[PDB]
Design a protein. Structure first.
Length: 119
């Protein structure tokens, strides 16, 4: 058995633009970077408070072939994304949530968090 971590992705608007605030299972604001110390999953739940109809479309990586995250799954309503991390390859990867919105046809990118694997 591995570990299942749960993070909430709160999105508000400030000055007409999205602001992403992550909270942990204790309701604490967390900066977003995570250390993974055994195989497991990371589950992100969207709490969209923007009124802009945000939905997750996926998780974006500048280095998608680095093997730090094995897979991304997404729910049919775009309210959840989950990362599979088997924590074999040690190292670090950065990713950004990619979201659609109902106001326009541009995708929305969150700013940057990091996954650190320690096998």
């Amino acid at each position: 058995q591995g570990l299942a971590q749960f993070i909430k992705v709160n999105v508000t608007l400030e000055n007409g633009e999205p602001v992403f605030i992550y909270t942990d299972a204790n309701g604490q604001v967390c900066q977003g970077d995570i250390t993974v110390t055994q195989a497991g999953t990371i589950t992100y739940l969207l709490n969209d408070q923007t009124l802009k109809g945000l939905k997750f479309v996926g998780v974006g990586f500048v280095t998608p072939f680095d093997g730090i995250i094995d897979a991304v799954t997404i729910s049919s309503d775009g309210m959840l994304v989950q990362l599979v991390d088997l924590d074999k390859t040690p190292g670090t990867t950065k990713f950004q949530f990619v979201l659609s919105n109902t106001a326009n046809t541009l995708l929305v990118l969150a700013p940057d968090p990091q996954i650190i694997n320690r096998p």
